[PDB]
């Protein structure tokens, strides 16, 4: 495991924002990995709207990269 | 020897407020009750979209972004001022970056206002995300020893 969530990160600017995973149960807790312009990983947690549309962001990001 | 992409990474130390107030404009500025940045570009064209300022300890990390969807104008110079002012200072000197030879066009000054901070990183990086491999001019400056910053994510203020 690269990474376990113990804190979450509060909101990121979506504009730093580069991919997101989801993290293994077996990691940490089961929650969102965030990766950043800097080349860095933090947790966030799924529940919270900013996170959700982070996520459809960089979703749209992907597509469109096809 | 085009960019598309500004971003402005300023570490200090250290620090002891974390409610902040931030602001892109003409004047773009991220201002807590005992610091205060501030920054100015001229004939940049990539456009600034945000900052951020996240604290862990006395440890914080912050700065200013560009997206990529535009290009330099080749035809001007990129300017970039950065002022790190202290709302308790007077001496108001300037920075050396660490020496370096750079393959993109670009005029920087970092001013430092009061002597606060024992700490203090401020890197600048101009990038051209059309590369295939990276491509990035990265103008840095210390005041002493490098922070390290990773583990501290890039929120936006609050």
């Known amino acids: 495991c690269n990474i376990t969530c113990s804190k979450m990160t509060s909101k990121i600017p979506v504009a730093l924002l580069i991919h997101y995973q989801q993290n293994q149960a077996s990691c940490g807790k089961r929650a969102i990995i965030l990766e ?31 | 020897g085009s960019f598309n992409s500004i971003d402005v990474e300023i570490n200090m130390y250290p620090v002891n407020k974390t409610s902040c107030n931030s602001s892109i404009g003409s004047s773009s500025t991220i201002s807590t009750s005992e610091l205060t940045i501030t920054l100015t570009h001229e004939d940049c064209t990539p456009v600034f979209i945000g900052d951020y300022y996240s604290v862990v300890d006395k440890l914080a990390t912050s700065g200013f972004f560009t997206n990529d969807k535009v290009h330099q104008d080749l035809t001007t110079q990129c300017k970039i001022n950065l002022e790190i002012k202290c709302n308790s200072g007077r001496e108001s000197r300037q920075l050396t970056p660490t020496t370096k030879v750079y393959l993109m066009p670009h005029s920087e000054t970092v001013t430092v206002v009061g002597d606060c901070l024992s700490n203090l990183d401020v890197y600048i990086v101009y990038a051209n995300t059309d590369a295939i491999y990276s491509d990035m001019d990265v103008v840095a400056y210390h005041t002493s020893y490098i922070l390290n910053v990773d583990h501290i994510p890039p929120n936006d203020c609050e």
């Open chain 1, 36 to 66: 950043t312009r800097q080349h860095r990983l933090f947790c966030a947690d799924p529940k919270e709207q900013w996170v959700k549309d982070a996520m459809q962001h960089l979703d749209r990001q992907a597509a469109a990269l096809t």
